[PDB]
Amino acid sequence: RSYQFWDTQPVPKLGEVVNTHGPVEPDKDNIRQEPYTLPQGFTWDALDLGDRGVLKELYTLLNENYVEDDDNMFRFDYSPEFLLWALRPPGWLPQWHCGVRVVSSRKLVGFISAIPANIHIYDTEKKMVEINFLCVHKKLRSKRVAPVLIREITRRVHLEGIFQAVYTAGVVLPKPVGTCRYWHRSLNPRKLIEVKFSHLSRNMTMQRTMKLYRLPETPKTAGLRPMETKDIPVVHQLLTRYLKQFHLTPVMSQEEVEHWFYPQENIIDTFVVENANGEVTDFLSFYTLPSTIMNHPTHKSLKAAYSFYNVHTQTPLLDLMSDALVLAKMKGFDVFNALDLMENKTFLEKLKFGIGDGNLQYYLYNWKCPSMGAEKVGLVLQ
Template sequence: MAPILLDEIKRRYCLSGRFQAVFVSKVAVAKPIATCRYWQRPLNPEKLINAGILRLSRSITCKQALNLYELTCQETDLLLPKIKVLGKHHLVSAFSLFTQYSEKHDLTACFTLTEFEHMFMPRSEIVYTYVIENDKEVTDFVSFYCLPMILPNNGIEYVIRTAYSLYNIAATVPLDQLLKAIMSIATKNNIDAFTVTDAMENSAACLEKLCFSKVDGLHFITFSTTGSVLG
């Protein structure tokens, strides 16, 4: 079904007068120019266990799982007060930081300031964006969006809210500390699981340190373009 849906989206897109694009797919419906992998971490392990999503091995109890995925630590407690919700007064500085960061990568989205505002300004229970500011200059930037799903299990319907990381720009703090603080904030926003891709600076070593586990692969595919596979 996915290839048929993609063909229809491409057809409608071309009718708008635009003929090149990048899309992502879990299935390699065409030769991808880049491939990465989703990694996921429970934020509310007890709920995920009850919903049947998180299955524990026989050697791990529920209490041990809760301790394993605990996010509270001294570094996080010190960092949290510095993290602010993105506001309109941050936009120009955040856009400048994002643009400089994007230029370091071979494949990236290009936004105007207006598009950046539309994409990243927080929207209740949909888009979450946070910054760290120093002397009124944004130095660090994190954004994710939330997708809820209803999952029935044993006669109970569980609403599972999963965060999907968009960008993590850590310039003044270690990335693992920034991600841990952001996941703590996500937990306070009733998010049950956190998902990132091992793209850009999100290395496997960093994600394993934070108790993420590998899940699905993700392929980046272009149409009406030519180029080499990105490393």
């Protein structure tokens, strides 16, 4: 393989073994003032997501043109309110919600975003951005619009004095810092089989399968309740302490922990364990991201929960994650998804998750370091 675009970028080569830790190139001290040129007939437009019409145009571009599974059966369906949670966290900047429109019709056909984040990578903490929501309309694919969108958001980030970034993708590019796998835990196996997310497995009847996946109707952990405003400080303390053990993690302020964890229905759920002394000792969290089931006459949507950050100090993680399943089931989810990062491999098989297809690769831009095992990746992105 060569990479016509990625070979020009300050990332390590696929196959180069990395022993050192540091930037790939030194920081730029004069940056290009003009936007990169789009192909004829298309124009940049910075999207004001606080305008409901504009946010709905972004909802529509992503609903019709964003990530599908490996078999072209399911497409993410991020909701407008979820996209406001994902894209306006503390420190968001309007120039970093970077849209491409057709000049004549004004139709939105491309987007890429950055949001700021402090990242801990081995022994270094650096201010970075997280790049997400790169999308080109299906009618514009394979025309090298993606390199323009990546160079343009690179420029706009460099203008604000930031020279590293973190991102994930399901394709292999120069050069993954860590390689993760999604696993899936059936909550509504009948629907999952029916829409062919799942198959009737290996000598089990549907009757047996529904039994195999049946869960308790209420969680078992004493003192589990939703996170409230008074818990913001201790959730922040728990998380900060917990993440020290991994090699790629976010460093969140208390304002960022309020944004990422405070519960918002149909977006983000966080439950804390408040013990018999009134102290919060653990928490679990998961976010809501349904998928469209394409071209299907009856079932139009699959409701999935995604494991976010789960912190245990007194409750065994196995038991916390069992309660997350019970909770997602009560909340009407069809499937609970989790990656094999952090300590998750200690529960995935025990709790009857099955491995999925594909991988999720993590990447750093303009930062060279040794790659790490999934168990040392402690960052989860939307």
